[PDB]
């Protein structure tokens, strides 16, 4: 006799993300060689850790102007993959294939303006439950960094990744208001002769930025 | 290497499965992105 | 046996009180992880349905159980009957990714679809009530679609469970609720 | 040439409770971590056995009232976890998945009265083949505990499991007209100026207490 | 572990078939149970 | 790729006593104990040996008369399991589900008159091919046995299984005018005062009767 | 043990194929045909 088998039902159908592989059809074939070849990547958060992309203002600019008025916010942006000020970055590009996410999202700032203008900025980070600070005064008391001009242009601060849970949607939800994960307020604290001087700014992964669950929702 | 998971060797052998390498005579991003700076370039106090 | 009753500390007699022998029991049928380990029956929606174990009917084995646990935690199982191919999408997904083919998609093969799918919710353990009647959205195991979805099993696999909460019977008009037993 | 096989008939087809796991289709997801929780239960009777839950009496108490007159019955009901007295018991809400049991069934009684109420009561287990006993002279002979009231509010008792099979069912048929197993009696001895007060019982499961054939029967 | 009765090795590698759990740094029902005062409180005759 | 395999026509079917089981739907069952049930048979020739049946004769009774005159025949009937005589036997009933056998079975005589009555009997085989024999000095001649009665009341004889081939069939085919097999003949020598009196007569199976091959045809 | 004949090992587990049978604390008929007595109960002349 032979070996029985029960054909199962429910199993065999082709799954467009299975673990198997197709039974082959043509062999023996060589390939030229391509070892050490410049420029590989095997992780794209390898590429995300190491070349910080620009974030996009009014106006469809990379930087921010410092201004000479009362208001002293430069920015305030929702901390989200799916916000404007990130749409342009490979960050939020990768984002969009993953529904979730955790760890730390770096900000790079560049100062621009000529030798002699000088500058103060304050970088914090307001937690989700309370509307964001308006002042650098009533932002002193969240997480914050303050930094100066001079000889070194850039100055990078690591934005935390605080939550209830241990991951966070990368999309925004449309009964989503009030923005889940929190604000980044770019201030300035004042500034001498740097009217109208550029500082520009860039986003880069930080060491335990994490993306999982693949998706593919269009965009 | 990718996105399998079978557990037993694959009935076919490997020079039909898949195409051959050969040699002559994450790579570069991987190493960039550990050479990274992450500390302070100053002075630091308390 | 006497004690204080007002303490809470559990108390066990024992047929021994009085000159019995207790004997040897048997419990692998009330394990969690066994007894949860089996296909429920829910009523599907004719495309989108969201997995969601709280759809489990109250009364049926799997959903009163399930109930009974505060906070749980498992991977999955589903088999669908369904038209066109079904395609699965994770926790936390766009909806629009329902339409896309590269998410899994299991091509239509007779008479029905089985797959083991793993635990996808952002929280280190989910709920079957939470104080904040509804439950966040962000509890669930992603979705599936199809042309058409005509039936819908659930099965629980690897289920832990914590903070056990009340389990109701049936409650008899008479002495004793009575129901026709299988009989020759 | 290849590996002859007989896909036999009768096997394979989908059964709700088949002892399989189905294809996997989407890998490599790492759960957070959720080690040590609290309050975790593994098995239904352990907390069944350390968690006794309330009895329901005539008029819908979780409590008997001692009475002055010459009936001396507390209580008396069918030993079936289909009984109304048990049917808001965790114990009978856990049955009802399972068609059959054995072992101990442990039931507690706590006075409430004040410290000058005092009271002596009597529980029995009054077996099959025979009416109930109406009066404490005549369920003497039947396996019984007698205790009084004091320092110690709670007293346990052990209802045994006796029959003719292994087993007993959970369910009660309908063409069971006398209680298959038996009686238990609740009786009240006499009483020392405790009208009115209140004796609560509950119910728990006892170390030997058994559940097995799993079913789901509505409910 | 639970309702499972197969004494082959699943085809699929663990990784594939389930989820994976981490670790941070009946349990207790069974230890309750356990703890269970299960004698007599007093001084016994005969 | 995966392994490929042939399913194979002609394989498969369902066959009503195929030697492989059915696949699994409810596990982990546990039995009540039942080790050392008294009066278990593991072989039903063990109980065909140990246990002697009733022959059948004239009449519907168990037992053939003393008789008083020149005929000498007791009973006389076809080597059969089909035969009427052995109708109602216990070896009969097993044998109409095999189709074949060969071996011994044994007749037992016990002597049922007073004690003042006495007889001397005699047992024949008496082989196919020719007529059986009439008178007992006819069958004198055939394997046979004579005995008497005494304190010992019964008396056991093998009737040895005599055949061309090494089988020999349970049924009995319609065209079959002639037993195949041959007949046993009980005679009776002569007898003091025994008149009326009772020899009843049981069938067992010998150690080395055999039953193969089993058939379902009705019955 | 009765009409099976394969020679591989049962693919589920014994406590899923059959019911488990407990202890506590052909048999007799065997032993019954057995002990048959079997000769001559008297003397035998050559």
Redesign the interface.
Known sequence: ????????????????????????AY?????????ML??????F???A??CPTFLRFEGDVPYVTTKTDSDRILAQFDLSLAAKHMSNTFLAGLAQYY??YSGTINLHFMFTGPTDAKARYMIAYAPPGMEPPKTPEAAAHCIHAEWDTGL?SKFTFSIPYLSA???????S?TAETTNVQGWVCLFQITHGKADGDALVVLASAG?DFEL??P????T | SG????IIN?Y??Q????????????????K??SS?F?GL?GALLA | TTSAGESADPVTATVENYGGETQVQRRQHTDVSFILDRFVKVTPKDQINVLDLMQTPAHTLVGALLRTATYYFADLEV?VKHEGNLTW??????E??LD??????????A?????ALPY?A???VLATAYNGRTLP??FNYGAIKATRVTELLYRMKRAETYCPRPLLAIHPSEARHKQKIVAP
Chains 1, 4, 6 share one sequence.
């Open positions: 006799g032979i070996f029985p088998v029960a054909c199962s039902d429910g199993y065999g159908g082709l799954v467009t993300t299975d673990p198997k592989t197709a039974d082959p062999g023996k074939v060589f390939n030229p060689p391509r070892n410049p420029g590989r990547f095997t992780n958060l390898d590429v850790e190491a529904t979730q070194n849970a241990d991951y966070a949607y990368t999309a939800d060491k999982r669950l998706v593919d929702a269009r | 996105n399998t998971g079978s694959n076919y052998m020079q039909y499965q898949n195409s051959m390498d050969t040699q002559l005579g994450d790579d570069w991003f991987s960039l992105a990274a992450s370039f | 088999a999408v994770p926790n936390g997904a766009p629009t990714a896309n083919t590269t998410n899994p998609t299991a091509y239509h093969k008479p029905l679809t089985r797959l996808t952002p929280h280190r959205t962000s």
